Amino acid sequence: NDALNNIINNARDGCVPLNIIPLTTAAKLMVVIPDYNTYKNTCDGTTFTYASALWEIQQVVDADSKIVQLSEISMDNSPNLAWPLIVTALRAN
Amino acid sequence: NNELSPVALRQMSCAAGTTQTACTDDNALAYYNTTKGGRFVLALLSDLQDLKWARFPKSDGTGTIYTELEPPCRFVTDTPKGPKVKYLYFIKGLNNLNRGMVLGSLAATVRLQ
Amino acid sequence: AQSFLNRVCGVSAARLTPCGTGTSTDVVYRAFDIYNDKVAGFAKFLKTNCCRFQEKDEDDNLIDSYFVVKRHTFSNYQHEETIYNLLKDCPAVAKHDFFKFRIDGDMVPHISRQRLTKYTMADLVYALRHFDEGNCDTLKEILVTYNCCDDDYFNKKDWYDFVENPDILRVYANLGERVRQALLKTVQFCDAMRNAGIVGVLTLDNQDLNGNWYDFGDFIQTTPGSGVPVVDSYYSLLMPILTLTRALTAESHVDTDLTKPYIKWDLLKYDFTEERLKLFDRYFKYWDQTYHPNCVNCLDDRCILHCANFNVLFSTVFPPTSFGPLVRKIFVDGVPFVVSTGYHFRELGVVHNQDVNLHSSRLSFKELLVYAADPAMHAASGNLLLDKRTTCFSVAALTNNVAFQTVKPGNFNKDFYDFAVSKGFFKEGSSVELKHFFFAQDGNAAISDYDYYRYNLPTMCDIRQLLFVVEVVDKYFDCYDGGCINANQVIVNNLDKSAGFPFNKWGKARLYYDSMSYEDQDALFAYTKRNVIPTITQMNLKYAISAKNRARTVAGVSICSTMTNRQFHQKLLKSIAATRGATVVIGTSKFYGGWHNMLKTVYSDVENPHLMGWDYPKCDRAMPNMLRIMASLVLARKHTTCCSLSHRFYRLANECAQVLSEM
Amino acid sequence: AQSFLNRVCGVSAARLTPCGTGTSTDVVYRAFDIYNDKVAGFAKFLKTNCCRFQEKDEDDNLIDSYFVVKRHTFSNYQHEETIYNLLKDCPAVAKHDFFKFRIDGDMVPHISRQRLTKYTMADLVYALRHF
Amino acid sequence: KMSDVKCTSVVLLSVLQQLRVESSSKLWAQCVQLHNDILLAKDTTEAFEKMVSLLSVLLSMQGAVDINKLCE
Ligand SMILES: [Zn+2]
Ligand SMILES: [Zn+2]
């Protein structure tokens, strides 16, 4: 993209650590949540924030990789899902 | 509790000067730790203003050591002839321990103002 | 009688109660740091000459501040008198008080210290460096006194364990602030002591747990502004506690003020050199040896260890994203790339590659390898990932969905079982039985075992004793011979194993060991002798019999690492594996009497022999970095002629970045 | 915590005071008469395994009678138990008390002597014969 | 005797796994749990009740036609 070139031009020597490259130029996030509690603390509603930037949820799957609607991520329904949910999101501008 | 100088050292006169050759002979006062591997000197004491080099033959007397020196230390010992300025020359690159040891020996040996 | 208490209370109005009986001294067990001319060491002695008075608070409840009164020689009296008169200014000194008293016909000297503490730093350090859960009572008293945890905690059995009950880390961490104050006050005292022209050795057991010093027993005089305080044993013994208690954790706040937020370091900054120098000056001013923040400039290996230690300490302050490969944008035949040109070690500071070239035309095999093996492209072209199943730092996900690996159960040989029960085995209650099975694992088995690295914590080592034991260990290792070897002398058994990632997509190690002429291999060696090549490591699940149902994993290092580590180490390795009667007994077969010879050799001739053997829990996951680096240096010590000095440092850097802290 | 201090006081006059620091033993210098097989003599040794509680008087002033509590082996416990049961009658014997307590997971033995004195005869004799 | 229970539990888990049960995820977790619990048990009774609870899985499906092999 351009943004990679941007953050490289910003650097005072044109060399930057590796850990921050996907942290600041990625376009897709993937979250792995073990239970419902940890789901509540972070992936809440259809948008959330991580890495000081806003993300919008786009698909949710379970261990077997079968689509799960946000409706049934209840507290009570939770003991009926293969439980390490995998949430893929998109960078919101 | 914890003591810092069980043993001290002895004294020698030797050669020193402003440059490697300006080292003329018998005007230096050396404190020497006579260790396992030969007579190892630590500090130099003189009234000469400043001297950048001392010159002492090796433990086997082959070569005369070329040892650059600290900026001299300023203090005024006394004798029957009143005040007496002397200068203490450390071999540059000396840990705090040897500084402390040499200072203990000297200060306990010689009177100041 | 009570006139003694009335006098000792001096003018600071204390409701002060006596704790030795009437006017006699008291017997206690304290830890000291002794070096006179005849005895020497650091151990628990029996202090005896002190009348100790517990100072009291309002409401007649007790409070931890005490007055301590000593009696000794008159010459000692005048000496402490004059020296305290010299130093009576800097807040780091406890307010003494000199007076005299008569019991019967004895105007006897008496020195009183005001508002001390029950223990000194030496007691804390001794308790933490000589721990035994059978009598760790003084430690318990310190912790409950300073409001770390409260008494009822200590009945929670296994409170002291590390693998078990990890909250002990927080509990210990609560002492950081106080330990820090101690260091700051030591610096202030060293300042005043140089200014007032005083010479004397500083020790641990002369400092209350508030930093206030006391006890000028054998300080001496000199012209003002020319006094050298000695701080070797002090810092050298204190060191481990600094990382055990997370002392410097205050430094990361907005202004070293535990209430304020965290500093916002920017994401792009990675140099961090002057910060390390400034911290070193703020906390260790009078340490008497140079310190290079970037170990590239070190002199011999001992300076490498000396500076890497401080780097281990200071690197626990700065943000964790600013470590790892440093990438940059290079062009080949009009195409932009992203490759790594350096690293940023937690121990060796910053390292820059020497041979880097922008604007290339074509790449031959060697460069194709070293580019495909870097994690730079793989991470820069992947999705961000936030894995909450662990606590280790994530980086990126390569493909769209995470794989879940499972472990199948074993297979049953019914014929042999029927045989063995037919001949009368496996009886109820017998001794021999079935204890070794093929335990199965479910989905999130791999990650649940990789998570076991959380037992690896930064560890600061006592630098002086380490610098001695490294010499002795080296001496255990002077019967062999090592050095580089050309490509045409390596010996590879089973050229048919996996080649790590990503090379395992195109065949086993036979391919790469069979498609690179000797020139390319020697060129690769020569290249890593001047650069750094980070690599990726893959984690594989073992499948074999055992008697404990934890999964087990083994790491598969890429071919770029082994292909060169072999040429660097194989000569010494094979020389070790072919010596008899040594201490290391690798390579000595146990058949044809080998067991007997080994036993006879180890039982050489000790006078009154007993045997003994121990065990390290979590050996490969809990070893701290410093001892791994030390081991690598001891191994490389056999290279005094083949390599030159910068070559040896770059080999150390490569081995670290490849097998110590890589993706 | 104030378990030891209380469940020790037993029943007689809850007017104790630790002259112990906590629930830990105490270090003192006493004179002993020692003949086991290897060492022998009459000298000052360093007794260590006793939690000593200074008993208090009315008006919260101190008084010289102490309770001394020891810990040792279970076999030692039963032995002292049965022998004290045998001899529990003649007024020449100090009223023991046997019980057990747990610090952490340990039902540990504990023997308590009631209303002793600070010193023994051996201390007086030693003081007067080694002046 | 107890060894016989451990052994047949090994064989049963092998059969289940080769009947593709590990494709589903929570079910395989439970089966692995019961198998590893049986392998470490000490007394026969509770091992037997875990054994029946685990066999219920194979019985709940229609891949193995037991009415065939139960011919003796
Ligand atoms: Zn260095
Ligand atoms: Zn070499």
Curated annotation (Swiss-Prot), chain E:
Cellular localisation: Host cytoplasm, Host perinuclear region; Host cytoplasm; Host endoplasmic reticulum
Oligomeric and partner information: Interacts with nsp8 and nsp12 to form the replication-transcription complex (RTC): nsp12, nsp7, two subunits of nsp8, and up to two subunits of nsp13. Eight copies of nsp7 and eight copies of nsp8 assemble to form a heterohexadecamer dsRNA-encircling ring structure.
Residues represented out of the complete protein: 3861 to 3932 of 7096
Protein name, as recorded: Non-structural protein 7
Main function: Plays a role in viral RNA synthesis. Forms a hexadecamer with nsp8 (8 subunits of each) that may participate in viral replication by acting as a primase. Alternatively, may synthesize substantially longer products than oligonucleotide primers.
Position of the signal peptide: none
Organism annotation: Severe acute respiratory syndrome coronavirus 2 (2019-nCoV)
Gene this protein is translated from: rep
Chain ranges of the RdRp Nsp7 cofactor domain: 1-72
